[PDB]
Coordinates of C-alpha atoms and ligand atoms in Angstrom, one line a residue:
Chain P
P1 CA 0.0 0.0 0.0
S2 CA 0.9 3.7 0.0
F3 CA -0.2 7.3 1.1
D4 CA 0.9 11.0 1.3
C5 CA -0.9 14.4 1.3
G6 CA -0.6 16.8 4.2
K7 CA 2.1 14.7 5.8
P8 CA 5.4 16.6 5.3
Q9 CA 8.7 14.7 5.1
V10 CA 10.3 17.0 7.7
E11 CA 8.9 17.9 11.2
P12 CA 8.0 21.6 10.8
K13 CA 9.5 24.3 13.0
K14 CA 7.9 25.9 16.0
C15 CA 7.6 29.5 16.8
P16 CA 4.6 30.8 18.9
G17 CA 4.1 34.5 18.4
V18 CA 5.8 37.1 6.2
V19 CA 6.5 39.9 8.7
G20 CA 7.5 38.4 12.0
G21 CA 7.4 34.6 12.7
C22 CA 10.3 32.5 11.8
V23 CA 12.2 30.8 8.9
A24 CA 10.9 27.2 8.3
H25 CA 12.7 23.8 8.3
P26 CA 13.8 23.3 4.7
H27 CA 11.1 21.1 3.2
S28 CA 8.8 20.9 6.2
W29 CA 6.1 22.5 4.0
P30 CA 6.2 20.5 0.7
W31 CA 2.9 21.8 -0.8
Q32 CA 4.2 25.4 -0.9
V33 CA 4.6 26.6 -4.5
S34 CA 6.1 29.9 -5.8
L35 CA 4.4 31.7 -8.7
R36 CA 7.1 33.3 -10.8
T37 CA 6.6 34.9 -14.2
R38 CA 8.7 33.6 -17.2
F39 CA 12.2 35.2 -16.8
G40 CA 10.5 37.2 -14.0
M41 CA 10.7 37.3 -10.2
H42 CA 8.7 35.4 -7.6
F43 CA 5.6 37.5 -6.8
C44 CA 3.0 35.2 -5.1
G45 CA 2.8 31.8 -3.6
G46 CA 0.5 28.9 -4.1
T47 CA 0.0 25.4 -2.7
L48 CA 0.0 22.1 -4.6
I49 CA -3.4 20.2 -4.3
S50 CA -2.6 17.6 -7.0
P51 CA 0.6 16.8 -9.0
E52 CA -1.0 18.7 -11.9
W53 CA -3.2 21.3 -10.0
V54 CA -2.0 24.4 -8.0
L55 CA -4.4 26.5 -5.9
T56 CA -3.5 30.2 -5.8
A57 CA -5.0 33.7 -5.4
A58 CA -6.9 35.3 -8.3
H59 CA -5.3 38.7 -7.9
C60 CA -1.8 37.3 -8.6
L61 CA -3.2 36.3 -12.0
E62 CA -4.2 40.0 -12.6
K63 CA -1.3 40.7 -14.9
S64 CA -1.7 38.1 -17.7
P65 CA -4.5 35.8 -18.7
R66 CA -2.0 33.9 -20.7
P67 CA -1.1 30.7 -18.8
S68 CA 2.1 30.8 -20.8
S69 CA 3.5 33.9 -18.9
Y70 CA 3.3 32.1 -15.5
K71 CA 5.8 29.6 -14.0
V72 CA 5.7 27.4 -10.9
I73 CA 8.6 26.5 -8.6
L74 CA 8.1 23.4 -6.5
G75 CA 10.3 21.9 -3.8
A76 CA 12.3 24.9 -2.7
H77 CA 13.4 26.8 0.4
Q78 CA 15.4 29.6 -1.2
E79 CA 13.6 32.3 -3.1
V80 CA 16.8 33.3 -4.9
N81 CA 18.9 30.6 -6.7
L82 CA 17.2 27.4 -5.8
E83 CA 18.7 24.0 -5.1
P84 CA 19.4 21.8 -8.2
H85 CA 16.4 19.5 -7.6
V86 CA 13.9 22.3 -7.5
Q87 CA 11.2 21.7 -10.1
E88 CA 10.0 24.5 -12.3
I89 CA 6.9 23.6 -14.3
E90 CA 5.0 26.0 -16.5
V91 CA 1.3 26.9 -16.5
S92 CA -1.1 25.2 -18.9
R93 CA -4.4 26.8 -18.0
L94 CA -5.7 29.6 -15.7
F95 CA -9.0 28.9 -13.9
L96 CA -10.1 31.9 -11.9
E97 CA -13.1 31.6 -9.5
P98 CA -16.1 32.7 -11.8
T99 CA -17.8 35.1 -9.4
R100 CA -14.6 37.0 -8.9
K101 CA -13.6 35.7 -5.4
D102 CA -9.8 35.9 -4.8
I103 CA -9.1 32.3 -5.6
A104 CA -8.0 30.3 -8.7
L105 CA -6.6 27.1 -10.2
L106 CA -3.5 26.7 -12.3
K107 CA -3.2 23.6 -14.5
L108 CA 0.4 22.6 -14.9
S109 CA 1.6 21.9 -18.5
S110 CA 3.3 18.9 -16.9
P111 CA 2.5 17.2 -13.6
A112 CA 4.8 17.9 -10.6
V113 CA 7.0 15.0 -9.8
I114 CA 6.1 13.9 -6.3
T115 CA 9.2 13.6 -4.0
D116 CA 9.9 13.8 -0.3
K117 CA 10.5 17.5 -1.0
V118 CA 7.2 17.9 -3.0
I119 CA 3.9 16.6 -1.6
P120 CA 0.3 18.0 -2.1
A121 CA -1.7 19.5 0.7
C122 CA -5.0 17.9 1.9
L123 CA -8.2 19.7 1.1
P124 CA -10.9 20.5 3.8
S125 CA -14.3 18.9 3.9
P126 CA -16.7 21.2 2.1
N127 CA -18.1 24.1 4.0
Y128 CA -16.2 23.2 7.3
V129 CA -15.7 26.3 9.5
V130 CA -12.3 26.4 11.3
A131 CA -12.9 26.9 15.0
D132 CA -12.3 30.1 16.9
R133 CA -8.9 30.4 18.4
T134 CA -7.3 27.5 16.4
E135 CA -3.6 28.0 15.7
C136 CA -2.7 27.6 12.0
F137 CA 0.5 28.0 10.0
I138 CA 0.9 30.6 7.2
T139 CA 4.0 30.2 5.0
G140 CA 5.8 32.0 2.1
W141 CA 8.5 34.2 0.6
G142 CA 6.6 37.5 1.1
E143 CA 8.1 40.8 2.1
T144 CA 8.5 42.0 5.7
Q145 CA 9.6 45.0 7.6
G146 CA 13.3 44.4 8.1
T147 CA 13.0 41.2 10.2
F148 CA 14.6 37.9 11.2
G149 CA 14.4 35.9 8.0
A150 CA 14.0 36.8 4.3
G151 CA 15.1 35.0 1.1
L152 CA 14.2 31.8 2.9
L153 CA 10.8 30.2 3.4
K154 CA 9.5 31.8 6.6
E155 CA 6.5 30.7 8.5
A156 CA 4.2 31.8 11.3
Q157 CA 1.8 30.3 13.8
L158 CA -1.2 32.5 14.2
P159 CA -4.5 32.0 16.0
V160 CA -7.7 32.1 13.9
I161 CA -10.0 35.0 14.8
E162 CA -13.7 34.4 13.8
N163 CA -15.5 36.6 11.3
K164 CA -17.7 37.4 14.3
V165 CA -14.8 39.0 16.0
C166 CA -12.7 40.3 13.1
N167 CA -15.7 42.2 11.6
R168 CA -15.9 44.3 14.7
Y169 CA -15.2 48.0 14.5
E170 CA -11.7 47.9 16.1
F171 CA -10.6 45.2 13.7
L172 CA -11.8 44.7 10.1
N173 CA -15.2 46.5 10.5
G174 CA -17.3 44.0 8.5
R175 CA -15.1 43.7 5.4
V176 CA -14.7 40.0 6.0
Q177 CA -17.2 38.0 3.9
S178 CA -18.3 34.6 5.1
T179 CA -16.0 33.2 2.5
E180 CA -12.9 34.5 4.2
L181 CA -11.2 33.8 7.5
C182 CA -9.0 35.9 9.8
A183 CA -5.8 34.9 11.6
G184 CA -3.4 37.0 13.7
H185 CA -2.2 38.4 17.0
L186 CA -4.1 41.7 17.8
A187 CA -0.8 43.0 18.9
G188 CA 0.6 42.6 15.4
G189 CA 4.3 41.9 14.8
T190 CA 3.7 38.6 13.1
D191 CA 1.6 38.2 9.9
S192 CA 1.6 37.4 6.2
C193 CA 2.2 40.2 3.7
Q194 CA 2.7 41.0 0.0
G195 CA 4.4 38.2 -1.8
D196 CA 2.8 35.5 0.4
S197 CA -0.6 35.8 -1.4
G198 CA -1.9 32.5 -2.7
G199 CA 0.1 30.6 -0.1
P200 CA -1.4 28.1 2.3
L201 CA -2.9 28.6 5.8
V202 CA -2.5 25.1 7.0
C203 CA -4.3 23.9 10.2
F204 CA -3.1 20.6 11.7
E205 CA -5.9 18.1 12.2
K206 CA -4.8 14.9 13.9
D207 CA -2.1 13.4 11.6
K208 CA -1.9 15.6 8.6
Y209 CA -2.1 19.3 7.8
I210 CA -5.3 20.5 6.2
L211 CA -5.2 23.4 3.7
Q212 CA -7.7 25.7 5.4
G213 CA -6.8 29.0 3.7
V214 CA -5.4 30.9 0.7
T215 CA -3.5 34.1 1.6
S216 CA -5.5 37.0 0.0
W217 CA -5.5 40.4 1.6
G218 CA -5.2 42.6 4.7
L219 CA -4.9 46.1 6.0
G220 CA -1.2 46.5 6.2
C221 CA 1.1 43.8 7.6
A222 CA 1.4 42.9 11.2
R223 CA -0.3 46.1 12.3
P224 CA -2.4 45.7 15.5
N225 CA -6.2 45.0 15.4
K226 CA -5.7 44.3 11.8
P227 CA -5.5 40.5 11.2
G228 CA -4.9 38.9 7.8
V229 CA -7.7 37.8 5.6
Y230 CA -7.9 34.4 3.9
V231 CA -10.2 32.8 1.4
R232 CA -12.0 29.9 3.1
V233 CA -11.1 26.9 0.9
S234 CA -14.0 24.8 2.4
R235 CA -16.3 27.1 0.6
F236 CA -14.6 26.2 -2.7
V237 CA -13.6 22.5 -2.3
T238 CA -16.6 21.5 -4.5
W239 CA -15.8 24.1 -7.2
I240 CA -12.2 23.2 -7.0
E241 CA -13.1 19.6 -7.5
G242 CA -15.3 20.5 -10.4
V243 CA -12.5 22.3 -12.2
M244 CA -10.1 19.4 -11.7
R245 CA -12.5 16.6 -12.7
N246 CA -13.6 18.4 -15.9
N247 CA -10.3 19.7 -17.0
Chain Z
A1 CA 2.3 52.1 11.7
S2 CA 1.0 53.6 8.5
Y3 CA -0.8 51.0 6.4
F4 CA -3.9 53.2 6.0
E5 CA -7.7 53.3 6.4
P6 CA -10.2 56.1 5.7
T7 CA -9.2 59.2 7.6
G8 CA -12.8 60.7 7.8
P9 CA -16.3 59.2 7.7
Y10 CA -16.7 56.7 5.0
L11 CA -19.5 54.4 3.5
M12 CA -18.1 50.9 3.0
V13 CA -19.9 48.8 0.3
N14 CA -19.5 45.0 0.8
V15 CA -22.3 43.5 -1.2
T16 CA -22.6 40.1 -3.0
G17 CA -24.3 40.7 -6.3
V18 CA -26.5 37.6 -6.9
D19 CA -29.4 36.9 -9.2
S20 CA -33.1 36.7 -8.3
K21 CA -33.2 33.0 -7.5
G22 CA -30.4 33.8 -5.0
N23 CA -27.7 32.4 -7.3
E24 CA -24.4 34.3 -7.0
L25 CA -23.1 36.1 -10.0
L26 CA -20.6 38.6 -8.6
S27 CA -18.7 39.0 -5.3
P28 CA -17.0 42.4 -5.8
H29 CA -14.3 43.2 -3.2
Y30 CA -15.6 45.8 -0.8
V31 CA -15.0 49.5 -1.6
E32 CA -15.2 52.5 0.7
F33 CA -16.6 55.9 -0.3
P34 CA -16.0 59.1 1.7
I35 CA -19.3 60.6 2.9
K36 CA -19.7 63.9 4.6
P37 CA -21.4 64.3 8.0
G38 CA -24.5 66.3 7.3
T39 CA -25.3 65.1 3.8
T40 CA -28.4 63.0 3.2
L41 CA -28.1 59.4 2.0
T42 CA -31.1 58.4 -0.2
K43 CA -32.0 55.1 -1.8
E44 CA -30.6 56.7 -4.9
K45 CA -27.2 57.6 -3.7
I46 CA -26.7 54.1 -2.1
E47 CA -27.3 52.6 -5.6
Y48 CA -24.9 55.1 -7.2
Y49 CA -22.5 53.6 -4.7
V50 CA -23.4 50.0 -5.1
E51 CA -22.9 50.4 -8.9
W52 CA -19.7 52.4 -8.4
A53 CA -18.5 49.3 -6.6
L54 CA -19.7 46.5 -8.9
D55 CA -17.8 48.3 -11.7
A56 CA -14.7 48.4 -9.6
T57 CA -14.7 44.6 -9.7
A58 CA -16.6 43.7 -12.9
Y59 CA -16.3 47.0 -14.9
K60 CA -19.4 48.2 -16.8
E61 CA -20.9 44.7 -16.9
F62 CA -23.9 44.2 -14.6
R63 CA -26.4 46.7 -13.3
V64 CA -28.5 46.7 -10.1
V65 CA -32.1 45.5 -10.0
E66 CA -33.2 45.2 -6.4
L67 CA -30.8 46.3 -3.6
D68 CA -32.6 44.2 -0.9
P69 CA -35.3 45.1 1.7
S70 CA -32.7 44.8 4.6
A71 CA -31.3 48.3 5.1
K72 CA -28.0 47.0 6.5
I73 CA -26.5 50.5 6.7
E74 CA -25.3 50.5 10.4
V75 CA -22.3 52.3 12.1
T76 CA -20.5 51.3 15.3
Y77 CA -18.2 53.2 17.6
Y78 CA -17.3 53.5 21.2
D79 CA -19.2 55.9 23.3
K80 CA -16.7 57.4 25.8
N81 CA -19.7 58.8 27.8
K82 CA -22.0 55.8 28.1
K83 CA -18.7 54.0 28.6
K84 CA -20.1 51.4 26.2
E85 CA -20.2 50.7 22.5
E86 CA -23.0 52.2 20.3
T87 CA -24.1 50.7 17.0
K88 CA -26.2 53.2 15.1
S89 CA -28.2 52.0 12.1
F90 CA -30.0 53.6 9.3
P91 CA -32.6 52.8 6.5
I92 CA -32.1 52.8 2.7
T93 CA -35.0 55.0 1.5
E94 CA -36.0 57.7 -1.0
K95 CA -36.1 60.1 1.9
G96 CA -32.7 59.0 3.2
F97 CA -31.1 60.1 6.4
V98 CA -28.6 62.8 7.4
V99 CA -25.1 61.6 8.1
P100 CA -24.6 62.0 11.9
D101 CA -21.5 63.7 13.3
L102 CA -19.9 61.2 15.6
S103 CA -16.6 63.0 15.6
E104 CA -17.3 63.4 19.3
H105 CA -16.4 59.8 19.5
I106 CA -15.0 58.6 16.3
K107 CA -12.6 60.2 13.8
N108 CA -13.4 57.8 11.0
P109 CA -16.6 55.8 11.6
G110 CA -17.6 53.4 8.8
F111 CA -21.3 53.3 7.7
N112 CA -21.2 49.7 6.5
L113 CA -23.6 48.4 3.9
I114 CA -23.6 44.6 3.6
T115 CA -26.4 43.1 1.5
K116 CA -26.9 40.8 -1.4
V117 CA -28.2 42.9 -4.3
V118 CA -29.9 41.5 -7.4
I119 CA -27.9 42.5 -10.4
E120 CA -28.6 41.3 -14.0
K121 CA -25.6 42.1 -16.0
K122 CA -25.6 44.5 -18.9
Chain V
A1 CA -14.3 66.3 1.0
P2 CA -16.7 69.2 0.9
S3 CA -17.9 69.8 -2.7
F4 CA -14.6 69.0 -4.5
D5 CA -11.4 70.2 -2.9
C6 CA -8.2 68.7 -4.2
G7 CA -6.2 65.6 -3.5
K8 CA -9.4 64.1 -2.1
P9 CA -10.8 61.2 -4.2
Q10 CA -14.4 60.4 -3.9
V11 CA -13.8 56.6 -3.9
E12 CA -11.1 55.1 -1.7
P13 CA -8.0 54.3 -3.8
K14 CA -7.2 50.6 -4.2
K15 CA -3.6 50.5 -2.7
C16 CA -1.1 48.0 -4.1
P17 CA 2.6 47.3 -3.6
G18 CA 3.7 47.6 -7.2
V19 CA 1.6 51.7 -16.0
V20 CA 3.1 48.2 -15.6
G21 CA 3.6 46.2 -12.5
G22 CA 0.8 47.8 -10.6
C23 CA -2.9 46.8 -10.0
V24 CA -5.8 48.2 -11.9
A25 CA -7.2 51.2 -9.9
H26 CA -10.8 51.6 -8.6
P27 CA -12.7 53.7 -11.2
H28 CA -12.2 57.4 -10.6
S29 CA -10.0 57.1 -7.5
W30 CA -7.5 59.3 -9.3
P31 CA -9.8 62.2 -10.4
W32 CA -6.8 64.3 -11.4
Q33 CA -5.6 61.7 -13.9
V34 CA -5.7 63.1 -17.5
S35 CA -5.1 61.6 -20.9
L36 CA -3.6 63.6 -23.7
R37 CA -4.9 62.8 -27.2
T38 CA -4.0 64.0 -30.7
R39 CA -6.5 65.8 -32.8
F40 CA -7.9 62.6 -34.5
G41 CA -5.8 59.9 -32.9
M42 CA -5.9 58.6 -29.3
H43 CA -3.8 58.5 -26.1
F44 CA 0.0 58.9 -25.9
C45 CA 0.5 60.9 -22.7
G46 CA -1.1 61.4 -19.3
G47 CA -1.4 64.5 -17.1
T48 CA -2.4 66.1 -13.8
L49 CA -5.4 68.4 -13.5
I50 CA -3.7 71.2 -11.4
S51 CA -6.7 73.5 -11.6
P52 CA -10.0 73.6 -13.5
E53 CA -8.3 75.2 -16.5
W54 CA -4.7 74.0 -16.1
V55 CA -3.0 70.6 -16.6
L56 CA 0.7 69.8 -15.9
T57 CA 2.6 67.3 -18.0
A58 CA 5.9 66.1 -19.5
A59 CA 7.2 68.5 -22.2
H60 CA 8.5 65.8 -24.4
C61 CA 4.8 64.8 -24.7
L62 CA 4.5 67.8 -27.0
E63 CA 7.2 66.8 -29.5
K64 CA 4.5 66.2 -32.1
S65 CA 3.4 69.8 -32.8
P66 CA 4.1 73.1 -31.1
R67 CA 0.6 74.5 -31.6
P68 CA -1.6 74.3 -28.5
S69 CA -4.8 73.5 -30.2
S70 CA -3.2 70.2 -31.5
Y71 CA -3.8 68.3 -28.2
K72 CA -7.0 67.3 -26.4
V73 CA -7.2 66.4 -22.7
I74 CA -9.6 63.8 -21.6
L75 CA -10.9 64.0 -18.0
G76 CA -13.0 61.6 -15.9
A77 CA -11.7 58.5 -17.7
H78 CA -11.0 54.9 -16.7
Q79 CA -11.3 53.3 -20.1
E80 CA -8.6 54.7 -22.4
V81 CA -9.9 53.2 -25.7
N82 CA -13.7 53.0 -25.9
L83 CA -14.4 56.0 -23.5
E84 CA -17.7 56.3 -21.5
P85 CA -20.3 59.2 -21.2
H86 CA -19.3 62.0 -18.8
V87 CA -15.6 62.0 -19.7
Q88 CA -14.9 65.6 -20.5
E89 CA -12.5 66.0 -23.5
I90 CA -11.3 69.7 -23.4
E91 CA -9.4 71.2 -26.2
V92 CA -6.1 73.0 -25.4
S93 CA -5.8 76.7 -25.9
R94 CA -2.2 77.4 -24.9
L95 CA 1.0 75.6 -24.1
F96 CA 3.6 76.9 -21.6
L97 CA 6.9 75.1 -21.4
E98 CA 8.9 75.5 -18.2
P99 CA 12.2 77.5 -18.6
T100 CA 15.4 75.9 -17.2
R101 CA 13.4 72.8 -18.1
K102 CA 13.7 69.3 -16.7
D103 CA 10.7 68.1 -18.7
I104 CA 7.6 70.1 -17.6
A105 CA 5.0 72.2 -19.4
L106 CA 1.5 73.6 -18.6
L107 CA -1.5 72.9 -20.8
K108 CA -4.3 75.5 -20.5
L109 CA -7.8 74.2 -21.1
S110 CA -9.8 76.5 -23.4
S111 CA -12.8 75.7 -21.2
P112 CA -12.6 75.2 -17.4
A113 CA -13.3 71.6 -16.7
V114 CA -16.5 70.7 -14.9
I115 CA -15.5 69.7 -11.3
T116 CA -17.5 66.6 -10.2
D117 CA -16.7 63.5 -8.1
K118 CA -14.9 61.9 -11.1
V119 CA -13.0 65.1 -12.1
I120 CA -11.1 67.1 -9.5
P121 CA -7.7 68.8 -9.5
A122 CA -4.7 67.7 -7.5
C123 CA -3.1 69.7 -4.7
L124 CA 0.3 71.3 -5.4
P125 CA 3.0 71.1 -2.8
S126 CA 4.5 74.1 -0.9
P127 CA 7.6 75.6 -2.5
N128 CA 10.7 73.5 -2.4
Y129 CA 8.8 71.1 -0.1
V130 CA 10.9 68.0 0.3
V131 CA 8.9 64.7 0.3
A132 CA 10.4 62.6 3.1
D133 CA 12.3 59.3 2.8
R134 CA 10.0 56.2 2.7
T135 CA 6.8 58.2 2.0
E136 CA 4.3 56.1 0.1
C137 CA 3.6 57.6 -3.3
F138 CA 1.4 56.5 -6.2
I139 CA 2.2 56.1 -9.9
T140 CA -0.9 56.1 -12.0
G141 CA -1.5 55.7 -15.7
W142 CA -2.9 53.7 -18.6
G143 CA 0.3 53.5 -20.6
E144 CA 1.6 50.2 -22.1
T145 CA 1.8 46.6 -21.0
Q146 CA 2.4 43.8 -23.6
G147 CA 3.2 46.9 -25.7
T148 CA -0.2 48.5 -26.3
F149 CA -2.0 46.4 -23.7
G150 CA -3.1 47.9 -20.4
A151 CA -6.6 46.4 -20.0
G152 CA -7.6 49.8 -21.5
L153 CA -8.2 50.5 -17.8
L154 CA -6.4 53.1 -15.6
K155 CA -3.7 51.4 -13.5
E156 CA -1.7 52.6 -10.6
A157 CA 1.5 51.4 -8.7
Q158 CA 2.5 52.3 -5.1
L159 CA 6.1 53.5 -4.8
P160 CA 8.0 54.9 -1.7
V161 CA 10.2 58.0 -2.1
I162 CA 13.8 57.0 -1.9
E163 CA 16.1 60.0 -1.0
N164 CA 18.4 61.9 -3.3
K165 CA 21.3 61.2 -1.0
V166 CA 20.9 57.5 -1.1
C167 CA 19.5 57.4 -4.6
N168 CA 22.7 59.0 -5.8
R169 CA 24.8 56.6 -3.8
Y170 CA 27.1 55.2 -6.5
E171 CA 25.7 51.6 -6.7
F172 CA 22.8 53.0 -8.7
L173 CA 22.8 56.5 -10.3
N174 CA 25.6 58.9 -9.7
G175 CA 24.5 62.4 -8.7
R176 CA 22.6 62.2 -11.9
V177 CA 19.7 62.7 -9.4
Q178 CA 19.6 66.5 -9.0
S179 CA 18.0 68.7 -6.4
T180 CA 15.1 69.5 -8.7
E181 CA 14.5 65.7 -9.3
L182 CA 12.6 63.2 -7.2
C183 CA 13.8 59.6 -6.7
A184 CA 11.1 57.0 -5.9
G185 CA 10.5 53.3 -6.1
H186 CA 12.9 50.5 -5.1
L187 CA 16.1 48.5 -5.7
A188 CA 14.5 45.2 -6.7
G189 CA 11.7 46.5 -9.0
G190 CA 8.9 44.8 -10.7
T191 CA 6.4 47.6 -10.8
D192 CA 8.0 50.8 -12.0
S193 CA 5.5 52.5 -14.4
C194 CA 7.2 53.2 -17.7
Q195 CA 6.4 54.8 -21.1
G196 CA 3.1 56.2 -22.4
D197 CA 2.5 57.2 -18.7
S198 CA 4.9 60.2 -19.2
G199 CA 3.6 63.4 -17.6
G200 CA 1.3 61.4 -15.4
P201 CA 1.1 62.2 -11.7
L202 CA 3.1 61.0 -8.7
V203 CA 0.8 62.0 -5.9
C204 CA 1.9 61.3 -2.3
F205 CA -0.6 61.2 0.5
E206 CA -0.4 63.7 3.5
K207 CA -2.7 63.8 6.5
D208 CA -6.0 63.5 4.5
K209 CA -5.4 64.5 0.9
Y210 CA -3.1 63.8 -2.1
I211 CA -0.3 66.1 -3.2
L212 CA 1.3 66.4 -6.7
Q213 CA 4.9 65.7 -5.5
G214 CA 6.3 64.7 -8.9
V215 CA 5.8 64.3 -12.6
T216 CA 6.5 61.0 -14.4
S217 CA 9.2 61.8 -16.9
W218 CA 11.7 58.9 -16.7
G219 CA 13.3 56.0 -14.8
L220 CA 16.2 54.1 -16.6
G221 CA 14.9 50.6 -17.4
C222 CA 11.2 49.6 -16.8
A223 CA 10.7 48.2 -13.2
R224 CA 13.7 46.4 -11.7
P225 CA 16.9 46.3 -9.5
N226 CA 19.1 49.1 -8.1
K227 CA 17.6 51.8 -10.3
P228 CA 14.8 53.9 -8.5
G229 CA 12.7 55.9 -10.9
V230 CA 13.5 59.6 -11.4
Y231 CA 10.5 62.1 -11.5
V232 CA 10.9 65.9 -11.7
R233 CA 10.6 67.4 -8.2
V234 CA 7.4 69.4 -8.5
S235 CA 7.9 71.5 -5.3
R236 CA 10.7 73.3 -7.1
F237 CA 8.5 74.5 -9.9
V238 CA 5.5 75.1 -7.8
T239 CA 6.3 78.8 -8.0
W240 CA 6.6 79.0 -11.8
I241 CA 3.5 76.9 -12.2
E242 CA 1.6 79.1 -9.8
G243 CA 2.8 82.3 -11.5
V244 CA 1.7 80.9 -14.9
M245 CA -1.9 80.5 -13.8
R246 CA -2.1 83.9 -12.1
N247 CA -1.2 85.6 -15.3
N248 CA -1.7 83.4 -18.4
Ligands
0GJ301 C1 -1.8 39.7 -3.3 C2 -1.1 39.2 -2.0 O1 0.3 39.1 -2.3 C3 -1.1 40.3 -0.9 C4 -1.0 39.6 0.5 C5 -1.0 40.6 1.6 C6 -1.5 40.0 2.9 N1 -1.9 40.9 3.9 C7 -1.9 40.7 5.2 N2 -2.2 41.7 6.1 N3 -1.5 39.5 5.7 N4 -2.5 40.8 -1.1 C8 -2.7 42.0 -1.4 O2 -1.9 42.9 -1.5 C9 -4.2 42.4 -1.5 N5 -4.5 43.8 -1.2 C10 -4.5 44.2 0.1 O3 -4.4 43.4 1.1 C11 -4.8 45.6 0.4 N6 -3.6 46.4 0.0 C12 -6.1 46.1 -0.4 C13 -7.4 45.4 0.0 C14 -8.3 45.0 -1.2 O4 -8.9 46.0 -1.8 O5 -8.4 43.8 -1.6

């Protein structure tokens, strides 16, 4: 027999309390992808759901509709000058969420070779709503404000804040739709930021990590009372499945 | 700490443009419009603002049919006197309502509008 | 803002870290944004509405014809190609180049533009005002993409002001950045607005409104590494500008 998905091949780091947080164990987060334009820099992240399919954030695909102008980097830790076994597949087709939500699917013009450095992430059960203060991990090569790590794959363990709370006047003041979740320390300091978009918000559930979010937006980075907003993948697991089965 | 928000009073339009049978058609990212304290906010102006926002996400496609009976145009702030939090709330109507002051308590209160509106698409 | 002041958009600007290499702006969040058009032909240069009858631009945008009634400004636009209803297209009466030129000239609108929530001038800075290091500025303009592309829709691009001391620091530009020039962007790039955006505004936010702190004239590449863009420092010519309008 056999099995994978959500079970990384390296015990992930650990730093309680991307701007802030800490650099990750090289290869502890195998599903992380890095959107990079042809002969162009890394600008967003993504996460591998299938060897062929990558889940990202529709606004990263704002520039070109041409699949051809997008490239995917799988199995890395370094943003600049990756290891020799890092895979770099090219995009076949762009599938943005039809109603304009900030989520989309990238079909790889060639499937990603699964290795102990490349493993998909497990998808959530449809419509499941991540608890209130559940601690999840956000990862990616996004910017920061002159902090601890950088050209490396940083990570962060943030507590989920429920729409109920994050839509309060001090926080996001009702800008959070039911289709998005919040995660962060009201104190700020640690958070995702530009360049992380599309990346995963994985929440550990028993044995594997479940992809519970797609980095999408936020009012600044790591500013207090301003958590980060993520698309709730449980509200799109059926649609995602539809695109994959019929394409 | 300067990753900005509206400096003065603002209306914030976060509406899911669906069809009539409820089916979703457009989910335009929220957009905030500066409104002055003292002006009057009629059913008409709200729509000028719901359109103004649908276009920001799906430009010139779609048009509004029926906003939705629920006048979800409420504002919340902290009342330093009551020592509690107040959540005002107004109705979307042809007669409208005058934009309250609220500076007494809040520098930049957000008059949120969060409803599903029936759009048809041009 | 009350009625229609200046530097005060009537829709909140969609910010974005990041014209090319910047997100598409919310319709009419940059009311001062103008589009210069040839008599018959379309776009080629952008501009800033400095007053109801005055527009500031890049002088090299006027290479094609000295005559003032050869250009047409378009105000209240988002779509560069097709063009919607209320989108005032004023004809230009006179053209005033700036002496001791860097690249700026003033276009005088034969008819004062109609100030509405989609058309509003920009605020000028105070004389010799020096826009601080790290200040978040905004590059806005339709100009290019995959050549002519640009969604046809007005795009922006958020860029922080560098600092003429550091900008000139050998490893990128050598005192080629003068005191009358503004240096903004970054040393990594991937969002520097280039070409067809020439003359467009570089409005930096301050307290509650936007100020015309620079004019898109050049950069030296097209969004990239150690090469921050170089816009003409508008606070230097705020006097001249001011004195052109009071008289001309
Ligand atoms: C596109 C993606 O790279 C970034 C990620 C920033 C994450 N933010 C926080 N606080 N963790 N996403 C964006 O830049 C999207 N835009 C914004 O977050 C805001 N600048 C604008 C909000 C909007 O209109 O969507």
